[PDB]
Amino acid sequence: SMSYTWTGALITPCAAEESKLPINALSNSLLRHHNMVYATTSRSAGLRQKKVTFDRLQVLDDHYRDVLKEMKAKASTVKAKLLSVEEACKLTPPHSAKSKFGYGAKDVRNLSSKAVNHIHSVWKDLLEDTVTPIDTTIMAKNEVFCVQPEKGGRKPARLIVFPDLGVRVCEKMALYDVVSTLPQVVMGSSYGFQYSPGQRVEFLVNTWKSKKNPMGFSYDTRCFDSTVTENDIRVEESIYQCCDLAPEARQAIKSLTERLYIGGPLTNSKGQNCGYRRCRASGVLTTSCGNTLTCYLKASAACRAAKLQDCTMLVNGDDLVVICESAGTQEDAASLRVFTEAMTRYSAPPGDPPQPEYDLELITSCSSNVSVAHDASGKRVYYLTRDPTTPLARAAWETARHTPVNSWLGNIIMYAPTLWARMILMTHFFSILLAQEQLEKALDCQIYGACYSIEPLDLPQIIERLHGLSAFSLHSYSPGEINRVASCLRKLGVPPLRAWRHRARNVRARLLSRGGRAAICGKYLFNWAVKTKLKLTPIASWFTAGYSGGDIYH
Numbered sequence: 012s013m014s015y016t017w018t019g020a021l022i023t024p025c026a027a028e029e030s031k032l033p034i035n036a037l038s039n040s041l042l043r044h045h046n047m048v049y050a051t052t053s054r055s056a057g058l059r060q061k062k063v064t065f066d067r068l069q070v071l072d073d074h075y076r077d078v079l080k081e082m083k084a085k086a087s088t089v090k091a092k093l094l095s096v097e098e099a100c101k102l103t104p105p106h107s108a109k110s111k112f113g114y115g116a117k118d119v120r121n122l123s124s125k126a127v128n129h130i131h132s133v134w135k136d137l138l139e140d141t142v143t144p145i146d147t148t149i150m151a152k153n154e155v156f157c158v159q160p161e162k163g164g165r166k167p168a169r170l171i172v173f174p175d176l177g178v179r180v181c182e183k184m185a186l187y188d189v190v191s192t193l194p195q196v197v198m199g200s201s202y203g204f205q206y207s208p209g210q211r212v213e214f215l216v217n218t219w220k221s222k223k224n225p226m227g228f229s230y231d232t233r234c235f236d237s238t239v240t241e242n243d244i245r246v247e248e249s250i251y252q253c254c255d256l257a258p259e260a261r262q263a264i265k266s267l268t269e270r271l272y273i274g275g276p277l278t279n280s281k282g283q284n285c286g287y288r289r290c291r292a293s294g295v296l297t298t299s300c301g302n303t304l305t306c307y308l309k310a311s312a313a314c315r316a317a318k319l320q321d322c323t324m325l326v327n328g329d330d331l332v333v334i335c336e337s338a339g340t341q342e343d344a345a346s347l348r349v350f351t352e353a354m355t356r357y358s359a360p361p362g363d364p365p366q367p368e369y370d371l372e373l374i375t376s377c378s379s380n381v382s383v384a385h386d387a388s389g390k391r392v393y394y395l396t397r398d399p400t401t402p403l404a405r406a407a408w409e410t411a412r413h414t415p416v417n418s419w420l421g422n423i424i425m426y427a428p429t430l431w432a433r434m435i436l437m438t439h440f441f442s443i444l445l446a447q448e449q450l451e452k453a454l455d456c457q458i459y460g461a462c463y464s465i466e467p468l469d470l471p472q473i474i475e476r477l478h479g480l481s482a483f484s485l486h487s488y489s490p491g492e493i494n495r496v497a498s499c500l501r502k503l504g505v506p507p508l509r510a511w512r513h514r515a516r517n518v519r520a521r522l523l524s525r526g527g528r529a530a531i532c533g534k535y536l537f538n539w540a541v542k543t544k545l546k547l548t549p550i551a552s553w554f555t556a557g558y559s560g561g562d563i564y565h
């Protein structure tokens with residue numbers, strides 16, 4: 012069936028959309044080539060619609076059925092419970108999209124009588140009706156990127172599809188425990204959201220080292236969400252139903268699946284009918300969990316179809332990486348085509364064909380790659396990094412404009428050991444926080460799709476817990492890593508690393524002259540900036556599951 016059917020109505024914005032990076036002194040000091048940074052708007056929604064709209068002709072075989080059977084057996088050992096209205100309300104983000112029925116996120120969090128009543132009303136309706144399609148709103152996402160000349164074009168806006176606030180709260184009650192616990196049990200070590208960056212690198216390196224002749228490859232599915240069929244979503248539900256669930260949990264899950272998850276009507280911000288969806292909605296609680304289960308199922312089946320030897324998969328939603336035993340270059344190339352053939356039959360054709368890689372550092376999975384550096388004692392330390400172009404583009408944007416999104420803070424947290432996060436992001440932002448006396452202002456940022464309120468002054472502690480003390484002492488980075496960073500800085504017009512060192516020393520001194528956590532930030536975060544190193548002694552739920560598009564607030 013067609014992933015989408017459109018009426019002709021346009022995907023419209025609900026407010027003014029900023030598309031260009033304003034000339035701002037603060038952002039300019041970080042990145043000069045401001046014309047290279049842009050934000051996607053609804054004006055390119057049409058280009059996105061054209062790409063995500065196509066016919067899926069799914070064909071399943073025994074391998075697919077064998078894997079599915081095994082997955083259901085693991086799901087049978089899981090017990091999940093319903094969340095109370097109160098529990099679901101507290102997981103609702105303070106600025107979540109308000110309901111069209113006269114109440115908002117704040118009312119939900121406060122448990123206003125009006126919010127709680129409509130919530131119950133929606134819940135009761137889910138139990139009474141398991142057929143009538145639930146309405147959803149379709150919007151173009153506003154995200155920031157750097158222009159890529161070689162691509163021959165700007166990236167079209169992504170489309171987000173989500174149901175009303177009342178429906179979102181009900182999703183939490185019926186499935187939050189399921190999506191938070193079931194994935195890890197069904198996919199074991201292959202489930203990527205159970206790992207912190209360091210644990211992920213650990214898993215990748217150990218897996219790679221466990222092979223005699225290692226070979227690995229990432230598999231990029233073209234428009235994954237659109238490739239997810241009604242049957243995929245129903246198979247997903249059968250997996251959820253294998254759990255030990257309360258009577259009305261099953262009813263609610265069946266209802267949400269048939270009325271929302273398998274598809275439904277699309278309505279723009281103006282209230283007009285844009286069309287119909289018959290694929291995954293990016294904006295529901297089960298998106299991450301469903302996508303990971305579906306990607307895992309199809310990939311596992313495809314590994315067997317391609318007869319890959321001693322396969323190990325790591326899956327994060329639609330992101331997939333496989334490490335196995337090489338059979339020769341020509342044979343590996345042939346095996347990958349068979350793998351792709353199977354994935355294609357299962358309704359998951361590639362964007363870029365997968366390519367066998369024989370060097371772990373050259374495998375990009377989930378926009379990242381393992382790399383190596385050395386700690387104070389010269390000991391080899393592996394860590395996750397990525398091309399810094401997008402993080403930097405977004406950092407500049409967030410510096411010049413007030414955004415509820417603080418990707419820069421998430422980037423520092425997840426990529427703390429990188430030279431770019433340490434020398435550039437830390438330096439730039441602590442310098443601004445000092446200037447604005449905002450060192451104590453908590454900021455919201457997403458980690459594995461969930462929203463957290465984080466204080467910048469708690470970075471040292473956070474980083475030590477996630478990456479170990481070595482994150483503050485890494486040096487002797489790889490030539491590959493060093494060149495990618497340098498290359499990125501020239502392209503964007505970001506001051507050279509040596510210029511950041513001078514700024515860091517200044518920022519470091521100012522932090523040490525301040526009290527408590529501030530001195531700890533100056534000492535630990537910027538020890539790399541001074542020749543006379545200080546002694547970095549140990550400082551005296553984030554990675555359990557994915558929730559992208561799930562409207563979760565922790």
Ligand SMILES: *[C@H](c1ccc(Cl)c(Cl)c1)[C@H]1SC(=S)N(NS(=O)(=O)c2cccs2)C1=O
Nearest residue numbers: 207208211327377421422425457458459460
């Ligand atoms: C890829 C990904 C997966 C795992 C790790 Cl450890 C990294 Cl660094 C990246 C996607 S999955 C996902 S959700 N996601 N957001 S996040 O990992 O929470 C980050 C937030 C700020 C920087 S990374 C990814 O990037």
